[PDB]
Amino acid sequence: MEVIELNKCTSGQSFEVILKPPSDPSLEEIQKKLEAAEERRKYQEAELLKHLAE
Amino acid sequence: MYTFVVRDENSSVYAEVSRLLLATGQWKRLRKDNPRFNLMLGERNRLPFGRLGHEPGLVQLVNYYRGADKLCRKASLVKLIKTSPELSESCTWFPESYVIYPTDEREVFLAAYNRRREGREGNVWIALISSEASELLDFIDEQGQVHVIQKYLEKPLLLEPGHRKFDIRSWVLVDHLYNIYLYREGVLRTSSEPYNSANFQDKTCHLTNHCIQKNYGRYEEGNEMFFEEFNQYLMDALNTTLENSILLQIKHIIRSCLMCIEPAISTKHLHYQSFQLFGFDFMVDEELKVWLIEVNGAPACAQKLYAELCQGIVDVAISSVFPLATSIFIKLHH
Amino acid sequence: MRECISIHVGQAGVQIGNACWELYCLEHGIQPDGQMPSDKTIGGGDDSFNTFFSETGAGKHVPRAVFVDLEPTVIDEVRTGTYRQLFHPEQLITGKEDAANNYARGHYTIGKEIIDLVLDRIRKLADQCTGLQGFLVFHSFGGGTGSGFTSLLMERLSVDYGKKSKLEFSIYPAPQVSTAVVEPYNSILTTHTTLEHSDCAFMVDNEAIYDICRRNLDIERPTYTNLNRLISQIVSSITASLRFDGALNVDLTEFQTNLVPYPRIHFPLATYAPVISAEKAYHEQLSVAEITNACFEPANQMVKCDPRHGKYMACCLLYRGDVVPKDVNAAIATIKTKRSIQFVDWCPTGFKVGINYQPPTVVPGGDLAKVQRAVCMLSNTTAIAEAWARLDHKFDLMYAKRAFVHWYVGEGMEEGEFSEAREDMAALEKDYEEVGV
Amino acid sequence: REIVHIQAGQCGNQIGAKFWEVISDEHGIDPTGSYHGDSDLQLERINVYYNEATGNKYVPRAILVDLEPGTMDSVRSGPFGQIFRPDNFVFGQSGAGNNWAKGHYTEGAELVDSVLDVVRKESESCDCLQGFQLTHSLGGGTGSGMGTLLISKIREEYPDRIMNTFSVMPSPKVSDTVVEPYNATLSVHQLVENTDETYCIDNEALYDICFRTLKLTTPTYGDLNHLVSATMSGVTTCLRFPGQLNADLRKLAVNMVPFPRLHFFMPGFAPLTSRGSQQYRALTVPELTQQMFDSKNMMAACDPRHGRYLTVAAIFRGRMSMKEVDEQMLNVQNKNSSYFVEWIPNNVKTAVCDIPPRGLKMSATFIGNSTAIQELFKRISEQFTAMFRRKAFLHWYTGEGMDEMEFTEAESNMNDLVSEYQQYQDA
Ligand SMILES: Nc1nc2c(ncn2[C@@H]2O[C@H](COP(=O)(O)OP(=O)(O)OP(=O)(O)O)[C@@H](O)[C@H]2O)c(=O)[nH]1
Ligand SMILES: Nc1ncnc2c1ncn2[C@@H]1O[C@H](COP(=O)(O)OP(=O)(O)CP(=O)(O)O)[C@@H](O)[C@H]1O
Ligand SMILES: Nc1nc2c(ncn2[C@@H]2O[C@H](COP(=O)(O)OP(=O)(O)O)[C@@H](O)[C@H]2O)c(=O)[nH]1
Ligand SMILES: CC(C)(C)c1[nH]cnc1/C=c1\[nH]c(=O)/c(=C/c2ccccc2)[nH]c1=O
Ligand SMILES: [Ca+2]
Ligand SMILES: [Mg+2]
């Protein structure tokens, strides 16, 4: 019903119609997570080469 | 070869449906959590509609209409009727009702309660049945959950011989095309004990539930009078017929309620499909005027009619979608 | 004028990016060689289209885009594509071996050795900006690169660009067009990691786009080319406000304002109409009322769900073509009385309309027909939670048996991160519930 | 993404040579090594299995291994015998004598380092090696004993590379010696640990196919290998030919192996054809889908109805409606969804290649990861236990320095593998 904030131009126009009213991790921490997972890989790859050494 | 699942074991109705399907040799039953189904005889609570119609290369169907609960809950039904312009405040076939929350339209209920007292007319109500507003509100707040206060029908039609109260149950099936099918066979769930106008304390003649009644089996087998008898009684006792005096109003109420919520629950253009069996309960007064009491989304049928109804559900609601290699229903056109 | 940088991660993101930038060039009249004859301000400027394009002294208009993949295959097709002269090599970044549909491999293992390179190439574009708004990120939930490396990148952008907004264009996984079975894992994992870093994300279910191509374009077996060209139309409608003159959604911050009241619930449902086959003859042109009414048909949505059983928090109508406010309001008045459009009590039941007199541009030789008027509705409804429910259910089924989990643990990830990411999704589903019912 | 092929032993080289003979025809490469095709699709992904030589010749990235010069001399004198690089012919003289111990510990240990030098030389020439593939039998000594020895050492030097294998399982129906269950059990223990994907090619199945289906009264190893080469050509199609598919060995392994130890797949192929006998009628899509799922087409003597599919991969070849394929594939699933685990959603993926194999207008290759494969391992276990309970023929191994404990361990590990398949068959 109520049309408001009608803005016009050459490209087109825009408006709002209301029908009814109402009723972060740091760079340190990030690097600490990426490297921690890398150690878990290095440990897994170590236990493999240890197992293969046996 | 179509496939289906069962996720409601207590369903006396769809236990017979599944039985019938397996007996065709063209329907196979899968496990509960097998998503690769064609049909879903789902549960009553927390039915996962959101996971339906996403299996590639599988037409899916469910025996429940999402959003139909707004019609099948007393608190919701009253709101639906009072707020819908199609039904409106002045709905002729729905008793005067109000929603009450335990400590809302409490002040609105008292305003009408006064006109009944300052008019010296019938002021009996039901949630227990009482004539005093104080005894009722105290009862609701002592239970815990939300209750609805409804105007009690003090002058009901009474069967004879017996001076007996009763209520009419109509089973309605809405298929995937939203065709409204009324089962031709209904039932009068009757009170075996005579109706007492004065004493409301005795709830064995005011309430006509099949469980409470179980004078059981005196007049008819199991306090259940079918249509061929009740029709005959009307002709002999009141010189009228069930079709004219009552059933037109019934078919009007059924047609009205489902037309109202159609744009909300219709699966016409959805990625999954829905049908559902409903159970409309009515109440006739002495002047042969049908009143709607409520609607059941998960109704149980009568023993005699299980064989015929459950077959009908398979024929029109299931086999219509999944075809295989006179009618028992009345189509309420709209 | 404030600039915007587009980031395309993985196969899906890159190829979709190609579809969008292909379309953007046609809309702004830019040629494959980067020349824009209509641009009378040679060498630079600060027009609306300069948000997505920067200008050289030679008069070339280059996208402010960075393509990244952990594999050379897809991006190489951009290097040798028809718009090869459009970009410059530093914008196109490729690795050696991909993430093999593994989130952990794309995030931790392979993501770690290239994240610094990407952020540097991104920084090169950021230095050419007088006032950077933020970023538009294109990726897939299913891919290891699109999921794993995206989440890692989004984390770093929030650090290196704290004041900048970040919008997502995500491809929700669909079994019909994916050969990956571990997509539910990657999807939950990348969402959990990116949720606090994304201001507004537009999900696009391939299932929906697939059927829309089958149903309305009469294509038996839609290809990614068919999907992307349709997706690029939607994306274009959403970003047109940034690339053209107007007053609605002129900045990325305004997307958050107009569509996202609650931060965590920042997944607006997009609906687009009309989609007409280019091979179809005797097509009757649909009116304002007919296309606006089609914005409330589930069969036109980017994600298949039922808004009727959900509550709205916001709603924008983005028209393109021959449309006037009078016809819109008359269409809204009709629809409001014939449909179930419930808003939350703490929001006004209304629509923010934006009209652009230029009709939608279609790729020559494409599947889409030229129409007189088109519309793209952006509505933030709780009914989109159905997409999360489907995704979390598939996750629970596989994870209950720890299937495929060893692939992720083998890349340094911890099994606890699975349950942690799932718990966050469980909390998200509840947030939709509270607002919904 | 290049692949290094290795073939060990009599069976491995006979099957391996047959494989190169087939795909060399598909890529339009002649026995000399010169390309003579018509489609660029034959050269877009030829780098995967071929190295580009000086005079524009294409040399297979293959390494031929054996502890006796017998078979490898038959290869070099064979049809495509000249295409192989001569430096890649690594061979001993003593042989393995169908002894796993000789191939893995004594005789093979003398030669294994010589092989790795060739592997290393091939790998260093790869722009981006995606993995290895091995062809061998498990009932012999070289391909079984030395084959698993190579795998163990390749993983040591290439821990982050995919290792696949085409393993021929022994069977009493097609048997060379009685100690085949011993060699097989010892090898399986190695394959469970050091391979990403093992394709169990049961000689029992290959025989029954030749006998019952192909109607061959007395099938030779040539008959058996025709079925193998056709299958091998199939499972390598998605890498050797381009079409709009972007997956390397790792990506495929990720979507086929839900659990590390359970990576033993059932090969399948349709239509099943015998050598020479040209078929004139091309099968329909419904016919390809029905046959490739039929037990009669499984190249691992296992009943898929006795187990459940963890993951399924099918690749159709030829000009056909991809829609009809999707319909027929989805039809099989929805008809027999009980034989697919419900806790891995959409575990049946499918692809289509426009280029059909030689002699067929269209075909389909089946790659099934079923728990029914345990029937194969149980079969080998019974044959193993029957002899080992009396310590029969064990002196052939203890004479090579082996102990009884190593047999008990290999026995136990395979029984553990069986129990694992049984765990997910009831889940
Ligand atoms: N709409 C659309 N979806 C795509 C496209 N390409 C891939 N996808 C989807 O992306 C998902 C898999 O992720 P990909 O983009 O292929 O993989 P990636 O992002 O390159 O990461 P990697 O696995 O490491 O290669 C699948 O579910 C596909 O449906 C595309 O061009 N258009
Ligand atoms: N307004 C009213 N006036 C008169 N009787 C009423 C009434 N509301 C309910 N009743 C009586 O109450 C009995 C049961 O009430 P109601 O149907 O609301 O409970 P219920 O719904 O839990 C049983 P069902 O779900 O099976 O129909 C009916 O037999 C009817 O006789
Ligand atoms: N299909 C097939 N199987 C073979 C062939 N030769 C041997 N085998 C099988 O392999 C086992 C013998 O192994 P063999 O290859 O001779 O051992 P090796 O040469 O010393 O490594 C037996 O169980 C045979 O069934 C062959 O040419 N084709
Ligand atoms: C989608 C499709 C059909 C390509 C697929 N999805 C999962 N697996 C495959 C196929 C294969 N998957 C494999 O793992 C595979 C292994 C392989 C490939 C080349 C050489 C040796 C083994 N070969 C395949 O063809
Ligand atoms: Ca300019
Ligand atoms: Mg990729």
Ligand SMILES: [Mg+2]
């Ligand atoms: Mg031999």
